[PDB]
Amino acid sequence: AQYEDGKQYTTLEKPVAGAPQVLEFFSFFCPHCYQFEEVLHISDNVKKKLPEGVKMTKYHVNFMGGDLGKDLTQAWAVAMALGVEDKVTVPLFEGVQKTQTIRSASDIRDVFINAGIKGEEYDAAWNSFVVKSLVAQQEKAAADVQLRGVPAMFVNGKYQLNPQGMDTSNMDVFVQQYADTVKYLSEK
Ligand SMILES: O=C(O)Cc1coc2cc(Nc3ccccc3)ccc12
Numbered sequence: 001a002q003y004e005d006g007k008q009y010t011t012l013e014k015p016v017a018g019a020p021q022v023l024e025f026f027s028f029f030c031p032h033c034y035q036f037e038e039v040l041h042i043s044d045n046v047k048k049k050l051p052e053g054v055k056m057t058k059y060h061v062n063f064m065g066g067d068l069g070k071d072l073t074q075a076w077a078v079a080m081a082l083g084v085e086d087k088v089t090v091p092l093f094e095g096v097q098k099t100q101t102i103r104s105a106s107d108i109r110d111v112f113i114n115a116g117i118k119g120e121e122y123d124a125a126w127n128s129f130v131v132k133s134l135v136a137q138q139e140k141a142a143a144d145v146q147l148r149g150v151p152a153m154f155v156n157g158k159y160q161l162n163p164q165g166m167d168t169s170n171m172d173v174f175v176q177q178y179a180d181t182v183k184y185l186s187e188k
Pocket of ligand 1: 036164167169170
């Protein structure tokens with residue numbers, strides 16, 4: 001076959017019921033996740049190849065960066081609750097990995113302030129129980145698949161993308177093969 005279990009993707013032998021259709025996991029500490037966002041635009045390219053209006057979800061993970069890693073999971077929960085993911089993704093990646101100006105929860109907050117989120121708006125969300133539940137949701141989804149590596153994408157809680165079996169000599173071909181594989185897996 002052209003797509004084979006163990007090549008472009010792997011199959012969870014403990015499938016996850018009720019999981020989002022397309023679920024991505026990342027960390028602002030994760031170097032390939034940086035490339036996935038700024039260089040390859042994996043998420044948008046996958047969306048362009050999926051049918052109209054299918055749900056794509058993207059969650060942060062705790063297991064990179066220790067204490068700040070957990071702060072970033074809470075900040076991503078804030079970003080999801082306010083709907084400002086498109087405004088803070090790039091400055092958070094660059095603040096952590098390029099300029100290395102993100103060293104504390106206060107530095108994370110500064111990114112939101114600079115992006116136009118009001119201070120009282122950010123603090124109220126940060127301490128809200130809705131965000132507490134969003135943090136729990138992100139942790140549970142990662143736990144459901146015993147996730148230990150990022151970037152990761154799962155399709156229908158059953159298939160895990162395997163980018164290690166994709167040619168990386170051409171970045172555009174890589175993204176296309178990745179997106180086409182997600183489309184193929186979604187149609188199973
Ligand atoms: O090797 C791995 O663990 C799999 C993997 C995960 O995310 C990646 C991102 C890239 N980025 C890239 C850079 C230049 C050309 C093509 C791709 C490459 C491999 C991976």
